């Protein structure tokens, strides 16, 4: 090696590499972009989905109707000829949500009495979070013990009676329903997340502040997934009464931004929610990407003239800071969504600030528009709504209109011409220059913020497609029969609206992206029209061509190994010839048959081509291949049993002997002519004790059911002796369900598909990823959950005569449970349901214990609720405590 000629070169290369890596790390840490994944909104008018919001923006209407009437407001003495009279408002209209009164308490675990004390804000936030999680494709139950920060912007307000006076039914829950801290704690508790939970209140800029904090937390790497939004729903007209005192409200209640007829900013209400993640992680996991956030800035006006009046210097400084943080020049923004409050004094100041920030150096005319013209001021719900509108219109490539802007304000200069009002829709086609936009939000406290939004990278293009022949099952779940029917009807309607879909795509979308709720229905489709008929039948309420079953807390399955019976064995076609797992699970066992039979995969086909000494090895091969296929498809047994010839297969699947070595060692003579239950001894045995010396059905199955497994998978080409198993199951304990793998005369893969459908309907856990290892199917948007809402609102002894005694005890227990939980309809509560999902806590637990003790005059342990989570268990325990 040449001294001082080559040695230094390697060191220089290493140093350059390290410097490049360090600078890349600095750049990534400082300003990594964040991507927007999901979308959720609840806006005035008929808006319930972002698509409806985009439709409203496109047609250009307004959602100002008038004051509501469900909240029980006086609505009469709210106005008077004298505006100075106490308790008098000024606004005679505005956009108000009509769904704040209704709620679904049963879907989550919450007692109705507790639900009656819940603020509408956190009431809506749960639904928004669930919808935004479902839309992104991530199943809600998947996110457990994972870092997922939550940030919500709210305003305290007031809902019910004062704490000091108290109530009658709601006494111990007035806190947790009427505070701002729990607004994110409730979501975290329901979803089981572990990321930070923060509630922030900064007047009208709360949503923007929350999204800025979420972006910072994502950038620092503290949390891998973020969730931000805002909400503002008022139940009392006191806010309008107060805001009428300084006369800052327009009479009609319409916002006219930058117009000549400014009178006020009105009022409205709404909510919004976003899901965020850094671009690299989103790309790695293949999550959908809609747009990219780059930079934000937060600032306060400081010592402004008075308290309410804003300042222009702070706005200019924050705009410049936001532009410089993301490294985007002032001449690289096509449109700006202004505050657009429509007040008399704010508009000239905002216009001058915008001219200073952008219009001073402009080549192309900037497009200006305000969303508050269509909806009115939404308090904390603003800001995020502007971002939603910007991303929607920028995805659609069309700039929406602005109402009541035909008369520009005279106090604002327009001679420069660098700023153009959006009086008409403007096309926004994609081009070489990436599209960008900016939003702003100024509150009454003084804090103001700004942000920059950019279009998604054009890398999604390049998708390939490929046809196929295997039909994938269709599944859907709900929380109640009515929910199931509504979900089926909605799916059918949506499919009717959008034709030309791919069955594989829909099956893939429905397989992953929905929770495993305890009301299941599944089937296998053949046509886009026949599936419509099946869905219509499901919506009507009759199960035809589909498997329907209800099962909760039942997820383990058990294989059963019978003897002979499917001697037709005509399914030698396909499977090992088509199914990759069945193909790979047949030869190695067949290779074990070579020692004394020379009986490989091909001679099985040639033997059939259309003596127990040769049926037994092929029976064992079929058993092991089917077991391998099932275990590869995600379902694994909790136990296994065998017939006279099934013990060999049981040992093979238990690990007693090797995969192929088990074959020709138990069958060394070759004709003789997992925790599992030893059928010969009727007890569980280890795989080790099985040897050469080793070589009551009702009792075995009843013991297995007592152990805690309530289903069996019958692995065979034909169902055999299943009726006896069902009869024994009915005669002891709960119902015992069994499903055959295949039926004689039907060797098609559709039989396996419907078998999988029945297994899913039986509550058996299925790994859908193995089913969709690869087919050429991608995600397709689908409708969300059809909640079932109802109106909630506050305003400011025998001596063992017979088992009939047992039913009496059960009925009185049911009545007491209905009474304590606040269920007004004291007619029915779920029987198999436990108590943790009914919303009963310690406060109600001790009251129920005292009621039961007083009713029957017995002493009952405090922790009995833990001992007997079910009403049936408690009834059985108490009926055995007699005498």
């Amino acid at each position, epitope marked *: *090696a*040449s*001294t*001082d*000629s*080559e*040695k*230094v070169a*390697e*060191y220089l*290369r*290493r*140093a350059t*590499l*390290d410097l490049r*890596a*360090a600078r890349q790390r600095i750049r990534e840490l400082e300003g990594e972009p964040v991507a927007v994944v999901a979308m959720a909104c609840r806006l005035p008018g008929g808006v319930s989905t972002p698509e409806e919001f985009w439709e409203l923006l496109s047609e250009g209407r307004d959602a100002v109707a008038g004051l509501p009437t469900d909240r029980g407001w006086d609505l009469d003495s709210l106005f008077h000829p004298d505006p100075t009279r106490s308790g008098t408002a000024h606004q005679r209209g505005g956009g108000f949500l009509t769904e704040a009164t209704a709620f679904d308490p049963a879907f989550f675990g919450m007692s109705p009495r507790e639900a009656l004390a819940v603020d509408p804000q956190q009431r809506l936030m749960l639904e928004l979070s669930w919808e935004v999680l479902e839309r992104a494709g991530i199943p809600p139950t998947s996110l457990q013990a994972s870092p997922t920060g939550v940030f919500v912007g709210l305003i305290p307000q007031e809902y019910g009676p004062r704490l000091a006076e108290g109530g009658e039914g709601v006494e111990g829950y007035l806190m947790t329903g009427t505070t701002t801290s729990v607004a994110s704690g409730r979501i975290a508790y329901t979803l089981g997340l572990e990321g930070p939970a923060i509630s922030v209140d900064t007047a009208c800029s709360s949503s923007l502040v929350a999204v800025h904090l979420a972006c910072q937390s994502l950038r620092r790497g503290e949390s891998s997934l973020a969730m931000a939004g805002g909400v503002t729903v008022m139940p009392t007209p006191g806010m309008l009464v107060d805001f009428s005192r300084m006369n800052s409200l327009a009479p009609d209640g319409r916002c006219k931004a930058f117009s000549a007829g400014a009178n006020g900013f009105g009022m409205a209400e709404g909510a919004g929610m976003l899901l965020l993640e850094r671009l690299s992680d989103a790309r790695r996991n293949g999550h959908p990407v809609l747009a990219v956030l780059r930079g934000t800035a937060v600032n306060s006006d400081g010592a402004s003239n008075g308290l309410s009046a804003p300042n222009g210097r702070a706005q200019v400084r924050v705009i410049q800071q936001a532009l410089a943080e993301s490294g985007l020049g002032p001449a690289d923004i096509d449109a700006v969504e202004a505050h657009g409050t429509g007040t008399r004094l704010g508009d000239p100041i905002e216009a001058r600030a915008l001219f200073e920030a952008y219009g001073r150096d402009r080549e192309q005319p900037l497009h200006l528009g305000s969303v508050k013209s269509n909806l009115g001021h939404t308090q904390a719900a603003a800001g995020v709504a502007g971002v939603i509108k910007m991303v929607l219109a920028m995805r659609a490539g069309t700039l929406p209109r602005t109402l009541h802007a035909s008369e520009r304000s005279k106090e604002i200069d327009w001679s420069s011409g660098a700023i153009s009002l959006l009086d008409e829709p403007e096309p926004w086609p994609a081009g070489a220059r990436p599209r960008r936009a900016g939003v702003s939000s100024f509150g009454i406290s003084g804090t103001n913020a700004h942000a920059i939004i950019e279009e998604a990278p054009q890398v999604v293009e390049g998708e390939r497609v490929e046809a196929g022949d295997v039909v994938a099952p269709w599944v859907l779940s709900a929380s109640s029969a009515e929910g199931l029917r509504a979900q089926a009807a909605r799916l059918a309607a949506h499919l009717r609206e959008h034709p030309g879909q791919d069955p594989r795509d829909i099956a893939y979308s429905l397989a992953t992206g929905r929770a495993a709720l305890p009301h299941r229905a599944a089937f296998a489709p053949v046509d886009e029209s026949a599936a419509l008929r099946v869905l219509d039948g499901l919506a009507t309420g009759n199960a035809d061509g589909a498997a329907v079953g209800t099962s909760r807390a039942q997820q383990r399955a058990v294989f059963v190994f019978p003897g002979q019976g499917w001697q037709w064995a005509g399914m030698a076609v396909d499977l090992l010839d088509t199914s990759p797992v069945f193909a790979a699970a047949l030869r190695e066992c067949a290779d074990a048959l070579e020692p004394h039979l020379d009986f490989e995969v091909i001679p099985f086909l040639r033997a059939e081509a259309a003596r127990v000494d040769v049926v037994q090895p092929v029976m064992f091969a079929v058993m092991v291949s089917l077991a391998s296929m099932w275990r590869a498809h995600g379902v694994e047994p909790a136990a296994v049993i065998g017939h006279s010839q099934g013990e060999i297969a049981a040992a093979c699947v238990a690990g007693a002997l090797s995969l192929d070595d088990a074959a020709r060692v138990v069958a060394l003579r070759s004709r003789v002519i997992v925790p599992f239950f030893s059928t010969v001894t009727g007890r569980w045995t280890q795989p080790d004790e099985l040897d050469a010396g080793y070589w009551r059905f009702a009792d075995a199955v009843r013991a297995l059911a007592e152990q805690g497994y309530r289903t069996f998978l019958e692995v065979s080409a034909h169902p055999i002796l299943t009726a006896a198993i069902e009869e024994i199951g009915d005669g002891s304990g709960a119902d015992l369900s069994a499903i055959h793998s295949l039926r004689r005369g039907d060797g098609s893969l559709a039989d396996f598909g419907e078998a999988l459908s029945r297994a899913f309907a039986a509550g058996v856990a299925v790994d859908w990823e193995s089913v969709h290892l690869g087919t050429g199917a991608r995600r397709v948007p689908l409708p969300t959950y059809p909640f079932q809402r109802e109106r909630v609102w506050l305003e400011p002894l025998a001596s063992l005569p017979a088992p009939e005694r047992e039913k009496a005890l059960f009925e009185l227990v049911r009545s007491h449970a209905a009474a304590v939980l606040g269920h007004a309809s004291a007619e029915r509560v779920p029987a198999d349901q436990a108590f943790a999902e009914l919303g009963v806590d310690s406060l109600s637990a001790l009251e129920l214990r005292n009621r039961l003790g007083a009713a029957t005059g017995v002493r009952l342990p405090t922790t009995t609720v833990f001992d007997h989570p079910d009403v049936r268990t408690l009834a059985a325990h108490l009926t055995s405590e007699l005498g």
Partner: antibody
Framework: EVQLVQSGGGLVQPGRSLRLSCTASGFTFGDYAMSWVRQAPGKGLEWVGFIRSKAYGGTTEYAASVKGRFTISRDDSKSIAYLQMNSLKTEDTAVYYC?????????WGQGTLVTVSS | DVVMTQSPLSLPVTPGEPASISCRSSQSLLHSNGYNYLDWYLQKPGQSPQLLIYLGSNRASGVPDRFSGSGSGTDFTLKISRVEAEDVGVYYCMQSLQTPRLTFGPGTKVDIKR
């Protein structure tokens, strides 16, 4: 990223012949210089050979107990290094490594057993 | 041209507190350019060797910040901060004045104190 893999290895009787393939990807292979090291099964690490780069041209030098025993080979079309085996000896039974750099031993390979017996 | 670690060959360690490995050399290196041609290597049990620090103390990327070299041209010593799990194996002192290097050296073992 930069990956190095090695292939070629098994049981060979004394006096046989063999070759070893080192595969590089993720960087401009031309500049760097390859080097082969060998660790005895239960001893330290001893350097074997080092091939220079075509920028300086040059060749290897090997060392004692290996000079005149077997040679190296290096390509440029697919960046595959070759170590030849000639008249293998039982004492040569040891794991072999291929690594980047001639003096500063940077990112290494994965190793190969390569046993010799009869 | 002859360098031996001279550090405790066993050097039992226990997590929490830090440690150090001395590396005494022959006549100092001090190349005219103003550097010391000494490197460090670490071998995990049953793993491929990896580089830790090249000339002086400028530990390369990927290496955790808990490692830090130091020393003059004839009294090199490697400092390790708070000790954690693993890091048990063989550490090697490597010179660069003589190109035809034959053997890395006996090295110093690392194991948990008991």
């Amino acid at each position: 990223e930069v990956q190095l893999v090695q292939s070629g290895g098994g049981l060979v009787q004394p006096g046989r012949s063999l070759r070893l393939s080192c595969t590089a990807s993720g960087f401009t292979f031309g500049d760097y210089a390859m080097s082969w090291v060998r660790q005895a099964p239960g001893k330290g690490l001893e350097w074997v050979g080092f091939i220079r780069s075509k920028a300086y041209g040059g060749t290897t030098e090997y060392a004692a107990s290996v000079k005149g025993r077997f040679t190296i080979s290096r390509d440029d079309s697919k960046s595959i290094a070759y170590l030849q085996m000639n008249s293998l000896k039982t004492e040569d039974t040891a794991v072999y490594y291929c690594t980047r750099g001639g003096t500063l031993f940077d990112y290494w390979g994965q190793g190969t057993l390569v046993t010799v017996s009869s | 041209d002859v360098v031996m670690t001279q550090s405790p060959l066993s050097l039992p360690v226990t997590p929490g507190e830090p440690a150090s490995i001395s590396c005494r050399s022959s006549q100092s290196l001090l190349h005219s350019n103003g550097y010391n041609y000494l490197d460090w290597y670490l071998q995990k049990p049953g793993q491929s060797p990896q580089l830790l620090i090249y000339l002086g103390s400028n530990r390369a990327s990927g290496v955790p910040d808990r490692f830090s070299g130091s020393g003059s041209g004839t009294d090199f010593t490697l400092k390790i901060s708070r000790v954690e799990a693993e890091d048990v194996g063989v550490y090697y002192c490597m010179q660069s004045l003589q190109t035809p290097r034959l053997t890395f050296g006996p090295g110093t073992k690392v194991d948990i104190k008991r």
